[PDB]
Amino acid sequence: TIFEERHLKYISQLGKGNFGSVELCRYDPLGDNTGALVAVKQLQGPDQQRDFQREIQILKALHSDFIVKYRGVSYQSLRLVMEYLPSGCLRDFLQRHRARLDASRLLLYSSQICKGMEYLGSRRCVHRDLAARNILVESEAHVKIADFGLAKLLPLDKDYYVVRPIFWYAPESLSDNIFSRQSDVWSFGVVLYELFTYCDKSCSPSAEFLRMPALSRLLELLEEGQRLPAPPACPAEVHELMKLCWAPSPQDRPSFSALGPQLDML
Ligand SMILES: N#Cc1ccc2ncc(-c3ncc4c(n3)n(C3CCOCC3)c(=O)n4CCO)n2c1
């Protein structure tokens, strides 16, 4: 739970979240290079130092097969140590191994994410940035949700939270900065789209919405009932779930708990 700085061997850069920098390291106390690989997040202002301390505590308290595992912290500077998922980001994974991933396997990922999200909801936690770029691949048969830097905990007497990339945002989030489990559902509809386009750049959410002020443009387009199209070779039933995920009103969207069985039984 407390990883010593001098034993964390820097290997390379894994990327930047919404927030800071993530680095691949080997925690190698014995010195043999036999140590376990770990992902280490850190910052390099007070406002994000505050949100970082929350993110550490959120990930620490969450326990699920489909959420990146917290492992500890490293100290006069605070770093977050997490398990390393060596197959990397789902976005890149899908583009690389498209040829060997049929619809059944995409549904498996959808279901695993749905179960991860169902768990978050029960911990009254709103991810706020659910997207393929923030999903990680544990193995070819297993994915996990990551990056809780923008994550908010619903007040204990409220089902929404108002707050201070737009193509994953629900309408009420764009217009009124309102976020909730239901705004997470909207975004889940977009990852379904990403899964079944194999995160192809040329037909990404941005490329489609751009083809269809930018924030006000998107919002007017959504209010008109226009949506991302059915991905090619996406089963019709899955497309219908996306459409339900993108219901105009938050209350008309299905819960993650209702989606799960619908995804599993196709
Ligand atoms: N947090 C975390 C976190 C926790 C464990 C973990 N094990 C592996 C990764 C990882 N491996 C490779 C990544 C990658 N993450 N990310 C970003 C994902 C969103 O968070 C910020 C980094 C990338 O852009 N790549 C490039 C190639 O896919 N990983 C990230």
Instruction: Specify whether 129 is catalytic.
Output: yes
Residue 36 Cβ contacting ligand 1 at under 6 Å = no
| Atom 22 of ligand 1: nearest residue by CA position | 15
- DSSP secondary structure letters along 246-261: T-SSGGGSPPHHHHHH
Widest Cα–Cα separation across the chain: 61
> Is residue 242 within 8 Å of residue 187, measured between CB atoms?
no
Q: How many CA atoms lie within 13 A of 180 on its CB side?
A: 17
User: Is domain 1-84 annotated with CATH 2.40.10.480?
Assistant: no
Residue 90 Cβ contacting ligand 1 at under 6 Å = no
Domain ranges of the chain: 1-84, 85-266
Resolution (A): 2.5
Residue 102's contacts (CB-CB under 8 Å, 6 or more residues apart) are none
The phi-psi region of residue 121 (left if phi > 0; otherwise alpha if psi is between -120 and 50; otherwise beta) is alpha
Tell me how far apart the alpha carbons of residues 132 and 188 are, in angstroms, rounded to a whole number: 9
- Answer positive or negative: Cα dihedral of 152, 156, 161, 162: negative
β partners of residue 179: 161
Which residue of the set 47, 65, 92, 129 is catalytic?
129
Roughly how many angstroms between the first and final C-alpha of the chain, as a whole number?
41
Tell me how far apart the alpha carbons of residues 173 and 128 are, in angstroms, rounded to a whole number: 10
The residue length of the chain stands at 266
Residue of 204, 64, 84 lying closest to 137 (CA atoms): 84
Mutate to test the pocket of ligand 1, among 13, 18, 21, 22 (most ligand atoms within 8 A of CB): 22
The DSSP code for 28 is -
- Tally of CB atoms within 10 A around 116: 24
> Is residue 188 within 8 Å of residue 245, measured between CB atoms?
yes
- Of the CATH numbers 1.20.120.530, 3.40.50.20, 1.10.287.1060, 1.10.510.10, which one belongs to the domain with range 85-266? 1.10.510.10
| Atom 30 of ligand 1: nearest residue by CA position | 39
